[PDB]
Amino acid sequence: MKGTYYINHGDPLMYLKKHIKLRQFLEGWQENVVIEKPKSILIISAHWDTNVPTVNFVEHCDTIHDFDDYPDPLYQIQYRAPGAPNLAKKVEELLKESGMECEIDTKRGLDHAAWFPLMFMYPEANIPICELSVQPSKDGIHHYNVGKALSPLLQQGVLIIGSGGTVHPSDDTPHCPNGVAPWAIEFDNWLEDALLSGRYEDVNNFKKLAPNWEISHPGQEHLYPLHVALGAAGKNPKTQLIHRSWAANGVFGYSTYNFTPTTQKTD
Ligand SMILES: [Fe+2]
Numbered sequence: 001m002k003g004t005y006y007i008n009h010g011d012p013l014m015y016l017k018k019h020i021k022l023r024q025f026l027e028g029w030q031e032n033v034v035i036e037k038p039k040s041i042l043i044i045s046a047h048w049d050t051n052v053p054t055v056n057f058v059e060h061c062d063t064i065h066d067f068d069d070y071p072d073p074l075y076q077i078q079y080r081a082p083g084a085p086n087l088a089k090k091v092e093e094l095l096k097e098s099g100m101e102c103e104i105d106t107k108r109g110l111d112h113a114a115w116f117p118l119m120f121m122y123p124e125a126n127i128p129i130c131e132l133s134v135q136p137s138k139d140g141i142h143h144y145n146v147g148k149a150l151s152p153l154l155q156q157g158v159l160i161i162g163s164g165g166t167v168h169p170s171d172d173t174p175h176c177p178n179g180v181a182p183w184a185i186e187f188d189n190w191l192e193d194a195l196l197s198g199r200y201e202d203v204n205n206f207k208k209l210a211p212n213w214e215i216s217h218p219g220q221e222h223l224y225p226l227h228v229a230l231g232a233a234g235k236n237p238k239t240q241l242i243h244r245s246w247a248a249n250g251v252f253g254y255s256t257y258n259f260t261p262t263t264q265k266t267d
Contacts, residue, residue, distance in 0.1 A: 147231020
């Protein structure tokens with residue numbers, strides 16, 4: 001495939017498990033999704049929440065274990081990827097050239113939205129990684145425009161990946177164990193239909209249109225990486241669903257999308 005992706009980083013517990021389909025999908029990334037080695041990777045992280053777009057600019061990525069109450073082994077994982085400082089500067093220029101602000105963090109490593117799926121996709125940790133934050137108090141259209149500014153990166157060998165959670169309710173939302181709560185089916189299906197239809201404006205305006213977005217994304221920070229990845233695919237991309245699974249609690253969903261460009265930018 002070519003283009004950009006919206007993936008789910010999933011449950012860190014899957015590191016210890018054998019039968020999680022999302023992990024199998026991620027492990028097969030280089031065989032089934034992206035054959036060609038990318039020059040660098042831009043991860044739009046649901047777990048880096050800022051006021052204005054921010055990008056990290058480091059030579060070596062720390063591994064940030066920003067998650068609570070997991071088993072000890074999870075905190076010993078190191079994903080020793082190189083940073084991507086030139087990619088970071090290029091993201092800052094592209095955003096500013098489009099009239100958007102962008103700040104640069106020269107210390108922050110990768111949070112688990114980045115390193116956790118990447119350690120399955122690219123276990124050799126030899127691809128330069130740069131993370132981009134989301135701005136959860138801004139709307140879907142903001143995030144789409146951040147991505148649109150970034151689409152020239154596609155012709156430069158950059159793999160752009162939004163890392164979120166397609167259905168990501170509050171911890172207080174009751175479970176439907178080993179099933180799928182109908183509200184979550186409804187939201188997931190609406191989103192799939194909007195994307196496969198090419199109704200990308202609807203996706204940007206999900207708050208006005210999507211059923212049960214209040215349950216699926218009370219904060220939205222796990223959805224907004226989709227808008228950035230979608231915008232980064234340029235005008236009129238074609239979307240396809242490349243993985244779907246659900247957590248055993250029946251209310252977290254991992255629908256995964258590829259956005260294939262049909263247009264390009266100037267020489
Ligand atoms: Fe998450």
